[PDB]
Amino acid sequence: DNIQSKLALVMRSGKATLGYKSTIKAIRNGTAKLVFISNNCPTVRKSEIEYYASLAQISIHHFVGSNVELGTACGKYHRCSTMAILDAGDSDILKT
RNA sequence: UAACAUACUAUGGCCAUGAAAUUGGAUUAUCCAGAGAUAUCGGCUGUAUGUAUGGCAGAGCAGCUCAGAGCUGUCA
Ligand SMILES: [Mg+2]
Ligand SMILES: [Mg+2]
Question: Distance from the CA of A21 to the center of ligand 1, in angstroms?
C-alpha cells in the first residue's frame, strides 16, 4: 500500500517526470527530489543514476517491481525504468 | 553515348531540441514509442545499373554532293 498509494497521491497532487532523460535532467537541474529505479533498469543506468543521485544527494528508491508495475503505479499506460518525483503535496515519503 | 573524373539526389540508420493518453505514428502486409513516438526555416550519415559536365563528336548512325575530298541532321 505504501508505494502504490504514495505514488498515486504524488501523481494526483504533485509533479513528476517519467523516463531516463527527464530524470537525469531533473537531477542535473536540481528539480529532482526523489528517484525511482526498477528491477529491469539496464545496469549501466541503475549505477549511473545511482551516481547522479549520490552526487546530488537525492534519495533513490529501488522499486519492488518491473517496468509495467512502475507505469501502472504512476497511472500511466507506458513502461518506465526510471522516474522522478518533483513535488508531492500530500505524501509522507518525500519527508523522512 | 563505354569504363573512368567531379558535384549533387537515392526506400535505411543515426544527432540534436522536445516530450506523447481524448494515445499517437505507419506499411499493400507487418510493426514502433517514456528503453523518448509524433513534430520542428533542424542536422549527420550510407547504397546508382540515377542527374549534370567532362569522355563527347572528332566517334557511331542517317541522309545528300563532288571527282579520295565534301555538306546536312542526329532534337524536345
Ligand atoms: Mg532521409
Ligand atoms: Mg559527325
Answer: 25
Structure determination method:
X-ray
How many other C-beta atoms are found inside a 10 Å radius of the C-beta of residue A24? 19
Resolution of this structure in Å:
3.5
Cα A72 from chain centroid? 13
Q: Which helix (H) or strand (E) holds A26?
A: helix A20-29
Among A93, A87, A82, smallest CA distance to A11 is for A87
Q: Name the nucleotide with the smallest C1'–CA separation from A79.
A: B34
Q: After which residues is chain A broken (C to N over 2.5 A)?
A: none
